[PDB]
Ligand binder design. Structure first.
Ligand SMILES: *c1c(C)c(C)cc2c1nc1c(=O)[nH]c(=O)nc-1n2C[C@H](O)[C@H](O)[C@H](O)COP(=O)(O)OP(=O)(O)OC[C@H]1O[C@@H](n2cnc3c(N)ncnc32)[C@H](O)[C@@H]1O
Ligand SMILES: CC(=O)N[C@@H]1[C@@H](O)[C@H](O)[C@@H](CO)O[C@H]1O
Ligand SMILES: CC(=O)N[C@@H]1[C@@H](O)[C@H](O)[C@@H](CO)O[C@H]1O
Ligand SMILES: CC(=O)N[C@@H]1[C@@H](O)[C@H](O)[C@@H](CO)O[C@H]1O
Ligand SMILES: CC(=O)N[C@@H]1[C@@H](O)[C@H](O)[C@@H](CO)O[C@H]1O
Ligand SMILES: *[C@H]1O[C@H](CO)[C@@H](O)[C@H](O)[C@@H]1O
Length: 474
């Protein structure tokens, strides 16, 4: 039926009959498998509106595909029976030297954007650390090595061009369709088919880049306390006058934790930075560094960048929260994090691992709660803990993910108990959030109500409600 309306309009489409149905509806997380009603492949903006009319006519719900690297298979549902908007014909990358803006859309990959910007203008741009993530999907937040210095991916979106539920295609930015743009910066999937993003680009912040590892020396016998002190001390440094936003810090959460990242600088500059950080750390930890040119370092931070490499599918689950600078970790809450992650009993049939990405810095201090639908003002930490099996065709029981989830939220609850009001990270959204949880974590500070108001205005028939976490209308 939906497939017949589409065929009527001249729109290339896949339905369960089509010989390529299986390949066209394969999501990245093998644990979450939406069966959609159809996949549309519009060739221009006319076909985008014509496909949405078919869905509106039929009552079919719509979601649109980015790079198909959702940690929770969001791009295909997750509810069954949706129309999938595959924008592969609208793929583009265009750098406007007058504005410094990169314009992009369709299933454009992080690695593709970086290689273009590099060979076009020897420039960089905010991006995550997986090469095959879609730039459109990661603009729901997006944390990279330069984010302490330059903001998240979402923070650098200057405008979008959106196809709406009734076929109108509009431009939105801070000056025009401003409430829709606000909503798109955090709830894009609930609001339109976004056909174009404009992200700000940057000259590399240094010629040379020092990548580093800080870890306990091989003879140290680190306890839980030693690990806590390394985390709290890293926090102390980031909050100190010694802090540099040119230092990315991924704090690997393990019984022998370690810090890894990149300093955008060389020579004595890095040595002064590393020195003030080490002096905040347990005395048994040791620093190791290497030095590369800027572009080579990008292939280190984003492995597989230069060959635009693909990531294997995973039987996967992630839970994540942000720590706002309004409640930094205390030794007690830092302790609860370790007890529930690295020092938790191992999972019977999955590997759990993760890190605290250190956030903070000047840019985040100047993000206001209401700058976007996604509330991300003045964050200090990004906590990620995930589980995976060894192979996409190897599963772990639901009860295993339950156990892991209850442990992580024991930490979150202790953090709350300490006074903290944890936030969320859209690209690391908890697939098991209720709406109550999704609003508190992603859309706090009264953002959610304003979000519903914008939803009710721009999609009142809930065409864009393919997921239990899609924003409901009034
Ligand atoms: C590394 C790896 C290996 C994976 C699988 C994910 C990673 C990652 N590294 C990350 C990192 O360093 N930093 C991050 O912040 N996130 C990282 N992620 C997670 C990744 O950012 C997210 O999973 C993100 O959702 C990926 O986006 P995607 O490739 O576009 O995935 P989908 O195609 O499934 O879309 C995601 C979500 O957004 C909606 N969407 C996409 N494109 C849209 C347009 N044009 N208009 C409207 N809505 C759009 C999808 O419908 C879906 O809800
Ligand atoms: C070079 C170095 O850091 N050595 C330390 C040493 O001082 C300490 O006694 C031991 C116990 O943790 O760990 C190791
Ligand atoms: C001190 C440090 O971490 N150096 C790393 C080195 O281990 C690694 O082989 C190389 C390529 O990834 O990047 C650099
Ligand atoms: C205060 C300190 O240095 N370390 C504490 C330890 O004393 C305490 O047993 C544990 C649980 O509260 O949290 C950590
Ligand atoms: C063709 C059509 O109805 N277009 C409408 C537009 O006028 C309105 O601004 C927008 C927000 O409700 O929804 C769409
Ligand atoms: C999408 O459309 C298909 C074909 O009409 C249905 O079978 C499905 O249940 C969903 O409504």
């Amino acid at each position: 039926e939906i497939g017949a309306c589409l065929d009527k309009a001249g729109i290339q489409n896949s339905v369960p009959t089509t010989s390529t149905w299986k390949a066209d509806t394969e999501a990245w997380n093998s644990r979450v498998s939406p069966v959609p009603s159809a996949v549309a492949f519009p060739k221009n903006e006319e076909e985008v509106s014509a496909a949405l009319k078919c869905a509106a006519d039929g009552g079919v719900k719509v979601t649109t595909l980015g790079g198909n690297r959702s940690f929770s298979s969001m791009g295909f549902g997750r509810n069954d029976g949706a129309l999938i908007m595959n924008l592969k014909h609208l793929k583009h990358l265009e750098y406007d030297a007058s504005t410094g803006l990169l314009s992009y859309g369709g299933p454009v990959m992080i690695s593709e954007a970086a290689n273009y910007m590099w060979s076009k203008a020897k420039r960089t741009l905010p991006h995550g650390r997986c090469p095959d993530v879609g730039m459109t999907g990661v603009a729901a937040s997006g944390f990279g090595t330069l984010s302490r210095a330059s903001g998240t991916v979402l923070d650098n979106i200057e405008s979008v061009r959106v196809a709406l539920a009734n076929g109108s295609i509009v431009d939105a930015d801070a000056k025009q369709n401003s409430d829709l743009f606000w909503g798109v910066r955090g709830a894009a999937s609930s609001l339109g088919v976004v056909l174009d993003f404009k992200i700000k680009t940057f000259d590399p912040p240094s010629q040379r880049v020092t990548n580093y590892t800080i870890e306990f020396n091989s003879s140290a016998k680190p306890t839980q306390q030693d690990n806590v002190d390394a985390l709290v001390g890293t926090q102390t440094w980031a909050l100190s006058k010694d802090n540099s936003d040119l230092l990315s810090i991924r704090f690997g959460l393990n019984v022998k934790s370690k810090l890894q990242g990149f300093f955008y600088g060389s020579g004595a500059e890095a040595k002064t930075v590393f020195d003030s950080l080490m002096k905040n750390l347990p005395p048994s930890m040791v620093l190791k560094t290497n030095e590369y040119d800027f572009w080579a370092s990008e292939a280190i931070s984003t492995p597989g960048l230069v060959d635009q490499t693909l990531t294997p599918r995973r039987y996967f689950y992630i839970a994540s929260v942000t720590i706002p600078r309004s409640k930094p970790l205390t030794n007690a809450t830092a302790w609860e994090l370790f007890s529930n992650t690295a020092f938790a009993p191992k999972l019977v049939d999955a590997s759990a691992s993760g890190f605290v990405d250190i956030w903070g810095g000047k840019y985040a201090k100047g993000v206001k709660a209401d700058d976007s639908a996604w509330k991300h003002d003045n964050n200090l930490h990004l906590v990620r803990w995930d589980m995976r099996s060894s192979a996409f065709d190897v599963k772990f029981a639901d009860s295993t993910m339950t156990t892991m989830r209850n442990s992580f939220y024991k930490f979150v609850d202790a953090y709350k108990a300490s006074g903290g009001v944890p936030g969320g990270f859209t690209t690391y959204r908890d697939e098991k959030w209720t709406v109550e949880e999704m609003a508190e974590y992603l859309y706090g500070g009264g953002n959610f109500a304003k979000l519903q108001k914008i939803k009710t205005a721009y999609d009142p028939n809930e065409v864009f409600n393919t997921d239990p976490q899609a924003i409901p209308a009034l």
